[PDB]
Write a protein that binds this ligand. Structure first.
Ligand code: NI
Ligand code: NI
Ligand code: NI
Ligand code: NI
Ligand code: NI
Ligand code: NI
Lengths: 117, 117, 117, 117, 117, 117
């Protein structure tokens, strides 16, 4: 995932950051303090960006032509996953964080399927 | 390109970094000094990574579903472009840097076409 | 611009980021939502910092000693430009973003003049 | 792990990066090409640094005073783990990468115990 | 402090960033303007993170086993310092920035004593 | 130095990084091992870049118009200092690192004079 390439990848990197995004959104509903809201927004932006980066890496580095041929919907899936993360950056609604997590889980399943083969 | 969204995008960001990548490869071919080779490798790696990031941003943030519908080859094209940059990272052959630039030029053409419609 | 040196520079890098700064300030006037204001401030800060970095690179790496002699106002011009960007960070007024862009335009003019020389 | 706090942590972040470190070392032992050795060293340095950062975060943010009281050797364990990663940066021997992974596994076990407490 | 190792370390790096954190909190006490509070929070978060990083480096790289033996409270002291910085990120009260600086001063004293032996 | 502004500046930040640059150059002069040379080069590049950044910040943020008028040679001094750091990146000769340090000492002197004024 370092582009050497090292041969080591794991969608869990994207998932953990996406989990933080959702967890922060959940916390934003229980504390309306201004400074907490500011910090929560700032940090959510950072974690969502990292999640997007991790997905971009799977798409650009790990997945190869044979994979896109076997999974014709993969390009759209990853593109929708990163767009969902952008939507989560602009929202305090945990549902947006959840949507990103759901797409990531779909990508994770495909990832491990290509690893077994 | 900052995901606000700010509405400001330009494939030029990717092109300039890719131009540096090819320029560095040309210099590496002419100077075999060990330390220069090390520094050139380090810097080329960094600029190619930035170029990949800029392309990933166009793909994830700027291009929308209607665009991928109008240009069914777009997903593949951007994926080829970033893979070409990965190839350039692992090469001192200016031809690899040029291949990345060729794809970026095709992406740039499509980008501006979407600005006309 | 990578300090190898690679021989590749373009004020366009600083300009695109400064354009995002102004675009963000304009958007901040059309949406008083708290979270949008927070995100816009966060992102504007990041893009302005990148713009300053790009100008710093032109100043320290591209422009050579003779250039500052041929253009006696150059040091002051770049310094005023980065300070204008610092001012844009602390303001939601698009006029501050524009002021930075005006200075960048003057730097861009000198840049190309030295390129053709 | 973002210091909000978000309540989301997983030693898996450190483990995956350490796995890349060892994987890179295995590749370095087989391919003596100068340019590959350069890139491998550059990238191994980066991934090892990320692994150290992830461990530092668990130590500074996740683990609380009661945890260090319950597991008196935890400070030493994490310190040994990060030092093992520094050693891996300076080595091409996969054994050094494995040593870091062994320490991380010890930390992972204590981590999950505190989670269940 | 770069992990080469270079042999150059100074707690001053951590101290200067922590001084910025407290200085920012002091400025936040004087102005309730929304955008200033947002910018101050964003920047304070960044400087506190750098301060934690510098301390983590002293802990992981500079201090060796003999040092932890000679100063049994060192592990706890550094951990308290970084935790104090996390607390400063979440506060506008200069007292939190001061608490972090006090711990850093204690670490600084031990650091220079170890440079004596 | 964070552009808030926070009012906290110290040339020590630039100096400590420049000291690492020279220290690394001296260590390179004593160990011709390939991998050590690679790591030393990679790390020297990073610390020199940080040193340049710190000087750029003093020039763009701390120093104001009155300072440049009182010290007509200040612009050129900082510019030559950063250029000296670029030269240090491209060299293994400790003399280049020392040249950078001598310029920083001159900037440090001026800095503190303006602080007492
Ligand atoms: Ni990798
Ligand atoms: Ni943008
Ligand atoms: Ni360059
Ligand atoms: Ni977190
Ligand atoms: Ni160091
Ligand atoms: Ni500051």
């Amino acid at each position: 995932h370092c582009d050497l390439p090292c041969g080591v990848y794991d969608p869990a990197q994207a998932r953990i950051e996406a989990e933080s995004v959702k967890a922060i959104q959940e916390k934003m509903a229980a504390n309306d303090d201004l400074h907490f809201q500011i910090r929560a927004t700032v940090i959510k932006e950072q974690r969502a960006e990292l999640a997007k980066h991790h997905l971009d890496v799977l798409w650009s580095d790990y997945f190869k032509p044979p994979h896109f041929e076997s999974y014709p919907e993969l390009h759209t899936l990853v593109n929708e996953a990163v767009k969902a993360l952008s939507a989560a950056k602009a929202s305090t609604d945990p549902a947006t964080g959840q949507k990103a997590l759901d797409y990531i889980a779909q990508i994770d399943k495909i990832f491990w399927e290509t690893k077994k083969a």
